[PDB]
Subunit: 290 residues, 4 copies
Amino acid sequence: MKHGIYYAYWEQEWEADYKYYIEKVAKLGFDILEIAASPLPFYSDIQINELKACAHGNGITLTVGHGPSAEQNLSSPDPDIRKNAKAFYTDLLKRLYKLDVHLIGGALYSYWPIDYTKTIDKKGDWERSVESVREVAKVAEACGVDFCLEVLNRFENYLINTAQEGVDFVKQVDHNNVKVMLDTFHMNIEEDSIGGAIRTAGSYLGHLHTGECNRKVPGRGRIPWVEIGEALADIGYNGSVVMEPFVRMGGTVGSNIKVWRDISNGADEKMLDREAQAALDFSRYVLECH
Amino acid sequence: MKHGIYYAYWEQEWEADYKYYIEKVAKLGFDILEIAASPLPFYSDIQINELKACAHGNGITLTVGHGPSAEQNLSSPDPDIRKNAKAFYTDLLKRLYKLDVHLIGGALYSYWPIDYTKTIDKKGDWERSVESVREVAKVAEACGVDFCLEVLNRFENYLINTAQEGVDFVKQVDHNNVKVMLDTFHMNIEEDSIGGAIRTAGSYLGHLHTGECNRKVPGRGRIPWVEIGEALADIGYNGSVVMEPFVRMGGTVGSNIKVWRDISNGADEKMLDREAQAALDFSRYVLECH
Amino acid sequence: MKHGIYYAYWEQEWEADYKYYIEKVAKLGFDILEIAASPLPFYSDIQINELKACAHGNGITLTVGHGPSAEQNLSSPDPDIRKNAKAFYTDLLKRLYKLDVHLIGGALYSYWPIDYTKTIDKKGDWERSVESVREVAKVAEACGVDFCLEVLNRFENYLINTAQEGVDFVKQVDHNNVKVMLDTFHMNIEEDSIGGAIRTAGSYLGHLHTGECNRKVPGRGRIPWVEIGEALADIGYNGSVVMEPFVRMGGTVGSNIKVWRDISNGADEKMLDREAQAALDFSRYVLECH
Amino acid sequence: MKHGIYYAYWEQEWEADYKYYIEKVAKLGFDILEIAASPLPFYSDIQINELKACAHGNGITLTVGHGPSAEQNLSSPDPDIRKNAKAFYTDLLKRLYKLDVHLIGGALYSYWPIDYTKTIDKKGDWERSVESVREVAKVAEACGVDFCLEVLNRFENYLINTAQEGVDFVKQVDHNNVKVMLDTFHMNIEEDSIGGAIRTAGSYLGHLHTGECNRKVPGRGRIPWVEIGEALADIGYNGSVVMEPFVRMGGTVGSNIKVWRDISNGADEKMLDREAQAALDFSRYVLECH
Ligand SMILES: [Mn+2]
Ligand SMILES: [Mn+2]
Ligand SMILES: [Mn+2]
Ligand SMILES: [Mn+2]
């Protein structure tokens, strides 16, 4: 099993010097760095090549997370937005092909964060999204990318809140490059059973995000890690596990992730490194081959 | 230990014939019905005495929950909003005295639901709220009402997200009628420890809301009910336990609680009744004595 | 699911007036009374018919538990003990036919309690037991009795300590009416996973005994009841659930179950009744199909 | 917090070259090797100083476990056995002083393994044991040794089965060098609450043994490690944590610990080393700094 961390653990904006984080997580012993998609459209082919060379040089696999804007919303009733969204993903998936990235994850069926004052048309957004994702999935297959649909808690999204809804959506899309993605933080709110949710996802599970109930690094909170390892073994999980911890106030990250107290308890960069490496040791030990 | 349920388990709007729910809940064997404050300011003295007489006649204690409007925001930097809020609560608390209600709970330090797009000033809102609540507390004392501040998950408020923040706030207020209120749904997201959060609240714990991780009736989900029972025994909790299950899509309640799937699994009124009664037997059994 | 309790919860010896306990458990709302086999060989035909009629008239199903003596040890290297053991079981099973009982459970592959000072030959005892049990199973089948092999913790037997070992033994026996019986008390010691153990048992699970870690009535201890409910649903469990609580010091039951402190906390008969009824309500609610 | 492991994890007899295991556990990063007391009475003064020199040289602290024989039974009604027991402990405690060992633990109030076929006089054995242990405590105080009384499950002893019984016994002994010792394996059977047992022990807790429910190395089983870390922080635990895993059949160890299946799943010495090191990383990470 391959283990990663989201760069945003260290950063307060949805961009960074990803080369700095490739070198860091390689030293800490991770297999994977997850990076935000949003700066990638601002990269020259030179910058893409040198990011790929950095990843290759440090023995790191890159995965991509994206929180789509309202303008990138494949579910939108406005056919202009759906057309611009499809263009955005087509460009992005081609960048991912040049980057040697084989996995993108997030609320890719919708947008994030969402405007909850808007009138909700779940059945309408659902039907439009399935159609749109099925189209985008043809580009994802051409670019060698797993298009992973993140199951989110009710506060962040209305379309897909449980593993069962995720399986329903992906089954309805009916394309090999579209996968369910589960997140221990999101499962913690919506699911009756964590092991049950993972077994429900079964062969459709393409990615797993990890974090404690309050998004601390895995190990010292209430997430049932042993039950998760057992369920991953039950479904013969052939895929990666990326921890997505957020312990710092401030910036767009602190605001979007709604960190309103110092969850890090005054941690400096070296303290964040030590706890990430401890969480990685824990994750390899507890989650692997049951 | 007294056990209650929120009328809203059965209803898709923030008011109802509370007399109907007093009779139902009395027959199901509850001690307490929790009602929404919203319609109480508009009750004639006749309507108040009718509700009180109905509660007394059925052996049911009434408690009150409130989601304050933006106009009722005691943390507001706008002094006219603060003035309205203080007048609103002063009138409400006089009515609760007439109604023979001795407990109100909710985001009473702030408002709910909140506009999260607005720039956040936590320090400013905190200092203003502490001052505002301390004033309202003196009217709460006169009216014999425990003014209980609900600790909420980061998605619903930024001010008080943990039992420790709740205790810090309530100690700063420094008034005996102002209490911390915990909710298993909210603790499930923000707390390192459920038992730890309860022991942290200790003497300041004035009210407890219950529900599964996804707001189903207590019993068949992942909430550590036994650990809660033990912590309530540890602190010597002398308060009441009110379940706050939300399993129904539709209406303002469905929208505000963000129920985007049929969590009830097609339950009619009779089925909701039986599940509430089973959850009550479970709650009396698992949460008491320890 | 059908729910039972072992009479011995109320009694300090391996016999009693079972008619008294049939009437008690019918009143408390149980489906099943489990009784000890020990006195049954000393029942006249009319005593058997009386017990059967008492059970039938009260809507109660009788199940039988047996701790075999050294002289009833089907695993014994001594061929005379094996011969006497088979004659004992043959007579007992014919008595169970007269009683209209269709389930016997316990360490029926061995004896209980065992002498652990003896040199252990697990390999030899296992081979003899599979052979012996296969022969007795044919008598059980003719009598309409399921022969359920209890998986026990290491302190009570050496042959079958895990669900996997139980499955291995029952597969070797290769008789349809020979089943694995799991016990929450025994699984709590020996199993990596409770849900895993139940899913390992699968179609071989013919009976389930319940009790907290320290053998209190189900509900207020550390046994993961929700996980058990989920696993029973996963395997489509068709059988019954009998709680086997032991909370009283004194006599052969006190000594054999090794109760060396008052686990009942001074409970009189009415208190034992009420705790059993609360555990039954808990068990129906929490274990019932997910 | 100092972490150790019992040498017997690697060995099937109650002795070995302790210097070999000092070197090994130093290499694996342990602070402590726990050793069996059995061979220490057979040690010359030169051998004591050798082992002390090896320990100091490798930066390892030595702790001692003892399973008393029947003739070392401080609870015995036979005053000759009590006389011999006190002589045995007086000599052992003087050797410990020379070895530079400041902690001994086990069923030091009784013996292990016990003959459970004997008539049990719990009240008598308790009264004698308290008096006997109080006298030995004077010698322990002189030799600078913490005399740690292991709380055991009902299958291994009848005197002290819970942390509460442990505290009552130690408080009755009323001596600063006599401590309660808890074991995750034994707590897992007898305790209503793991956190609650540790908080019950509080200031009396002198030593903690760790192991999964079935005595595997900590981390991948059902023991609530986070809850343990929390309770240790609550009582400000000043002591060490020694893992006591037993995963191998064969010899006196296999027999006494009742390992009747290959729990090690065919692990060689190298594999046992790796799993102990994984469990140490897990234990340092999860059990500290709550
Ligand atoms: Mn995520
Ligand atoms: Mn609430
Ligand atoms: Mn049993
Ligand atoms: Mn031990």
